Amino acid sequence: SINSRLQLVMKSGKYVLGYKQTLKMIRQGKAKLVILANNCPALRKSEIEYYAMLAKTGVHHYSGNNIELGTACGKYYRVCTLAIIDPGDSDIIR
Amino acid sequence: VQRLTYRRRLSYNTASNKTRLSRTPGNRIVYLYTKKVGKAPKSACGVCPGRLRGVRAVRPKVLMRLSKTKKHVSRAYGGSMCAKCVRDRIKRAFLIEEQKIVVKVLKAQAQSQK
Amino acid sequence: GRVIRGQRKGAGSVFRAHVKHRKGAARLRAVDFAERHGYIKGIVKDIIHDPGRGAPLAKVVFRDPYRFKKRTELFIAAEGIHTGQFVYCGKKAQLNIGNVLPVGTMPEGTIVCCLEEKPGDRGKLARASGNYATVISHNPETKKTRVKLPSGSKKVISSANRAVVGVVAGGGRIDKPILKAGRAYHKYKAKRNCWPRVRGVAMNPVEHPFGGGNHQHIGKPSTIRRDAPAGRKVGLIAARRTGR
Amino acid sequence: RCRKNTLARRKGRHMGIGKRKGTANARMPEKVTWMRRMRILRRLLRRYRESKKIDRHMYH
Amino acid sequence: AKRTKKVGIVGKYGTRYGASLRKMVKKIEISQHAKYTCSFCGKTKMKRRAVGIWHCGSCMKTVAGGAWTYNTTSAVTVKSAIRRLKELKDQ
Amino acid sequence: PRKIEEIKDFLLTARRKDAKSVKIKKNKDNVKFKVRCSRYLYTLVITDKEKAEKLKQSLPPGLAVKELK
RNA sequence: AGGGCGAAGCCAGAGGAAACUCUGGUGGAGGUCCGUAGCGGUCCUGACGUGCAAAUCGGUCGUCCGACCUGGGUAUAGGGG
RNA sequence: AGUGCGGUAACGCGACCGAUCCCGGAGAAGCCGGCGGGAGCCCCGGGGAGAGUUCUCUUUUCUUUGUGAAGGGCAGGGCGC
RNA sequence: GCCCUUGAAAAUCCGGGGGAGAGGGUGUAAAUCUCGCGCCGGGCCGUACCCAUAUCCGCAGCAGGUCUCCAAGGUGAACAG
Ligand SMILES: [Mg+2]
Ligand SMILES: [Mg+2]
Ligand SMILES: [Mg+2]
Numbered sequence: 001s002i003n004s005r006l007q008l009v010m011k012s013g014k015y016v017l018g019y020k021q022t023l024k025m026i027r028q029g030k031a032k033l034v035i036l037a038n039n040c041p042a043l044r045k046s047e048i049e050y051y052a053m054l055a056k057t058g059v060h061h062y063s064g065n066n067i068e069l070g071t072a073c074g075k076y077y078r079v080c081t082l083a084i085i086d087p088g089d090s091d092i093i094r
Numbered sequence: 095v096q097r098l099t100y101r102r103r104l105s106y107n108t109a110s111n112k113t114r115l116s117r118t119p120g121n122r123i124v125y126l127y128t129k130k131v132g133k134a135p136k137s138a139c140g141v142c143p144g145r146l147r148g149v150r151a152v153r154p155k156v157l158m159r160l161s162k163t164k165k166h167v168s169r170a171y172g173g174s175m176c177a178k179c180v181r182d183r184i185k186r187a188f189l190i191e192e193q194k195i196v197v198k199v200l201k202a203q204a205q206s207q208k
Numbered sequence: 209g210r211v212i213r214g215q216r217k218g219a220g221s222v223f224r225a226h227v228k229h230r231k232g233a234a235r236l237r238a239v240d241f242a243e244r245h246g247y248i249k250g251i252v253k254d255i256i257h258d259p260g261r262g263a264p265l266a267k268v269v270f271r272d273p274y275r276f277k278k279r280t281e282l283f284i285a286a287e288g289i290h291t292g293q294f295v296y297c298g299k300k301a302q303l304n305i306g307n308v309l310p311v312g313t314m315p316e317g318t319i320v321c322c323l324e325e326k327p328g329d330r331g332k333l334a335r336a337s338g339n340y341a342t343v344i345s346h347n348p349e350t351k352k353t354r355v356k357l358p359s360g361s362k363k364v365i366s367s368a369n370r371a372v373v374g375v376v377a378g379g380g381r382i383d384k385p386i387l388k389a390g391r392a393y394h395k396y397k398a399k400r401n402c403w404p405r406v407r408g409v410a411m412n413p414v415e416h417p418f419g420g421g422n423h424q425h426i427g428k429p430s431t432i433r434r435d436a437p438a439g440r441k442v443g444l445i446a447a448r449r450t451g452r
Numbered sequence: 453r454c455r456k457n458t459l460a461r462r463k464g465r466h467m468g469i470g471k472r473k474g475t476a477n478a479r480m481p482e483k484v485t486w487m488r489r490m491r492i493l494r495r496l497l498r499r500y501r502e503s504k505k506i507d508r509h510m511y512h
Numbered sequence: 513a514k515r516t517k518k519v520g521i522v523g524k525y526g527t528r529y530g531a532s533l534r535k536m537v538k539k540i541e542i543s544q545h546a547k548y549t550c551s552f553c554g555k556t557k558m559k560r561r562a563v564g565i566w567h568c569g570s571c572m573k574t575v576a577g578g579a580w581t582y583n584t585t586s587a588v589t590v591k592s593a594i595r596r597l598k599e600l601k602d603q
Numbered sequence: 604p605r606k607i608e609e610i611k612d613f614l615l616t617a618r619r620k621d622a623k624s625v626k627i628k629k630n631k632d633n634v635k636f637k638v639r640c641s642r643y644l645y646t647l648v649i650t651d652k653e654k655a656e657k658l659k660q661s662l663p664p665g666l667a668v669k670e671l672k
Numbered sequence: 673a674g675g676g677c678g679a680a681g682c683c684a685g686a687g688g689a690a691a692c693u694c695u696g697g698u699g700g701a702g703g704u705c706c707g708u709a710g711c712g713g714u715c716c717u718g719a720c721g722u723g724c725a726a727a728u729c730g731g732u733c734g735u736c737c738g739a740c741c742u743g744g745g746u747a748u749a750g751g752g753g
Numbered sequence: 754a755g756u757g758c759g760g761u762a763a764c765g766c767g768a769c770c771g772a773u774c775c776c777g778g779a780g781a782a783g784c785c786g787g788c789g790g791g792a793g794c795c796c797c798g799g800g801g802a803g804a805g806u807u808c809u810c811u812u813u814u815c816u817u818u819g820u821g822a823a824g825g826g827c828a829g830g831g832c833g834c
Numbered sequence: 835g836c837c838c839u840u841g842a843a844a845a846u847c848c849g850g851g852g853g854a855g856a857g858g859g860u861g862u863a864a865a866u867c868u869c870g871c872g873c874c875g876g877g878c879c880g881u882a883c884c885c886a887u888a889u890c891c892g893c894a895g896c897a898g899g900u901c902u903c904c905a906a907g908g909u910g911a912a913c914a915g
């Protein structure tokens with residue numbers, strides 16, 4: 001499961017939550033992975049999906065809706081897009 | 095106190111018969127009849143509830159008088175559509191066409207395979 | 209004596225329908241090559257309220273396939289429709305909700321509404337609010353389909369004639385009590401002059417056949433022929449059985 | 453003559469139980485009295501915060 | 513039960529209309545005024561606009577739903593059946 | 604009406620074909636110069652008195668120069 | 673007009689192991705109450721009763737955000753509306 | 754070469770070619786509550802000009818004390834930019 | 835906030851997408867949903883006064899009826915008296 005591996009990333013690794021910030025992380029070429037909630041707007045997703053394709057970056061569609069993902073980042077707010085810059089000691093990146 | 099009367103034969107207080115008080119140089123409070131409140135145009139997108147920027151919200155039969163620059167804005171879809179909905183239309187219309195090309199490529203490979 | 213309230217509703221006049229603010233008819237798209245052979249795609253531009261109607265409607269806009277021109281329709285909203293959704297329709301339409309396709313295509317047990325009673329009629333059966341029909345069974349030759357209507361009846365139908373998949377939106381309206389007479393008044397005012405209704409027992413015997421008496425009673429049987437001249441046909445018409 | 457009497461009303465006069473006809477809430481509406489208070493105390497709080505007297509979390 | 517023991521929303525109606533009706537209204541009267549979650553953004557803003565039509569204020573997604581609930585049960589059960597049959601047809 | 608800010612500009616407006624009366628209001632502390640045209644009544648505020656007295660001479664062919672009192 | 677009652681939602685504090693409950697606020701619901709204009713028209717079986725009036729007057733009354741009141745336009749005509 | 758240019762951008766600048774065709778907007782929206790801003794009026798403290806009172810008291814009490822539209826500037830509101 | 839109430843049409847006016855066309859050939863052109871200025875025109879009918887305890891309708895200068903706008907000080911919850 002992905003929730004478990006994220007937990008560790010959020011604890012120990014470096015990361016960034018949200019679309020304005022993750023698109024800046026990909027555009028820098030630092031972002032190693034991009035998680036998308038399922039409810040994300042369709043235009044947004046396809047835009048991000050293209051940005052990863054240009055930057056040769058992983059894109060993982062999360063199983064849950066943006067409330068679940070934010071819950072799954074350990075935040076009381078809700079996150080639709082999340083980039084993983086440096087995982088701490090997790091194998092979120094395979 | 096100076097009470098006052100309407101200045102036109104329309105007695106009834108209506109959408110048409112709206113007023114305001116004004117002190118003249120003669121030093122008498124007088125009714126002036128007021129012009130209706132114009133609205134800025136809403137977006138062609140139709141989801142963005144907020145009305146458009148950089149347009150003189152004025153009663154539509156005035157627009158006639160106004161200069162072109164007042165009536166619009168320097169952009170593609172200028173003064174017809176909000177920016178956000180343009181820069182989403184743009185990248186949408188682009189990203190869509192890139193996938194149409196990808197499906198065309200996957201179709202052509204499948205023809206060459208078969 | 210008098211022409212009774214009831215006979216009078218036929219002359220229209222006061223008892224005609226109130227239709228200023230009504231947003232239009234709630235049809236289906238008309239058939240054409242695209243509908244007939246493939247599937248035309250349109251988008252749901254908005255969902256609307258239509259006075260005197262419990263079902264909400266849906267401005268659905270297509271592209272006319274002959275003139276450069278964006279034609280638009282008023283579908284009755286299938287429940288779970290929303291804006292910025294696409295609404296495909298035709299023979300080769302995908303069997304998902306808010307998607308109008310011929311009854312002959314769609315499998316058995318398939319729930320539909322705004323279902324064409326006769327091919328090309330533009331959507332006549334099951335278009336109320338919480339209502340729908342179910343496609344029972346197909347006869348491939350004869351090109352006919354059996355459909356179970358909300359009344360219970362199991363009507364036979366041409367397999368060509370279309371329907372929107374899914375039930376009608378705004379269901380369970382009638383679970384809420386009205387309470388206030390006022391609330392009744394406000395319902396029928398956006399419809400037609402049919403409300404505060406006076407019982408024929410109340411009336412003098414010139415304006416209704418139950419009228420008169422020293423006691424508010426009917427006096428004759430309240431069941432009645434339907435070979436009955438208009439003016440008597442009052443109470444329970446052709447009532448097969450009458451009680452609880 | 454009025455002006456003189458209004459000056460009496462300032463001193464706190466002709467204002468006892470037996471010269472009131474309206475309810476207390478009519479005379480000074482409780483809502484308005486509340487509105488004043490919030491608009492005071494809140495104004496005091498955000499002045500304190502914006503002088504670094506009190507921190508974010510205290511303020512809240 | 514701060515202000516009322518057992519009327520809540522239907523305390524507006526006062527004594528009127530009878531106990532059963534007012535109890536019967538309390539169910540709907542609650543649900544219809546409820547703010548639901550917009551399964552589109554995920555904010556709690558789905559609010560009935562008029563009968564059978566619910567609007568997210570943020571999402572701006574108007575959504576044909578039930579008369580007093582964003583979803584009827586009927587609609588939900590119909591949805592799943594259609595999805596099942598769709599899969600049965602195409603494979 | 605229209606206020607003007609350059610002594611030259613008012614001189615150019617006064618020199619048009621459409622113009623006529625160029626009345627002059629000594630307000631004390633101000634000395635305006637109101638020159639009527641077809642459409643607008645142009646005015647020009649000239650705070651100095653000697654500069655106003657100088658301009659007085661600089662209007663051209665025999666216009667009204669109907670000084671106001 | 674102006675008042676009264678103070679429904680949902682919201683805040684804090686206190687208790688509760690939880691479920692949740694109490695206390696103080698805020699909030700302003702309603703074919704809600706009082707009560708003006710308005711609309712009406714209970715009683716005095718008052719006045720008047722060759723009247724002011726071919727139905728009026730006085731006090732007293734009902735209602736006063738709603739099946740509210742109301743101008744103009746428009747529809748329905750005689751065994752018909 | 755030349756169917757204007759500025760701003761990261763919201764957008765800006767006095768003008769800035771253009772048909773049938775198409776899309777959109779404005780015209781074009783219920784009632785009720787609360788709160789806020791702007792005026793008119795009222796109020797208060799004073800300046801003046803004219804009044805009335807003055808047996809005693811009263812720096813008195815009373816009146817009056819202005820700037821149209823249209824432009825330009827600037828507050829002051831608002832913004833789901 | 836309320837609605838099993840969701841609360842006008844059209845004339846007219848503008849914006850945008852498109853890009854069929856048009857412009858002159860190195861001092862000018864076509865172009866100004868033209869910017870600033872300049873010139874000429876805007877016909878037809880209504881326009882007195884009353885608008886109500888005396889200009890209206892109730893046979894009358896009839897205690898009846900008849901749609902609106904403006905709306906000072908004091909007392910007072912108050913457009914109550
Ligand atoms: Mg008019
Ligand atoms: Mg502009
Ligand atoms: Mg009777």
Ligand SMILES: [Mg+2]
Pocket residue numbers: 209413414416417
């Ligand atoms: Mg009979």
Ligand SMILES: [Mg+2]
Pocket residue numbers: 717
């Ligand atoms: Mg009597």
Ligand SMILES: [Mg+2]
Pocket residue numbers: none
């Ligand atoms: Mg007598």
Ligand SMILES: [Mg+2]
Pocket residue numbers: none
């Ligand atoms: Mg008399």
Ligand SMILES: [Mg+2]
Pocket residue numbers: none
């Ligand atoms: Mg006159």
Ligand SMILES: [Mg+2]
Pocket residue numbers: none
């Ligand atoms: Mg009068």
Ligand SMILES: [Zn+2]
Pocket residue numbers: 137139140141142176178179
């Ligand atoms: Zn938009």
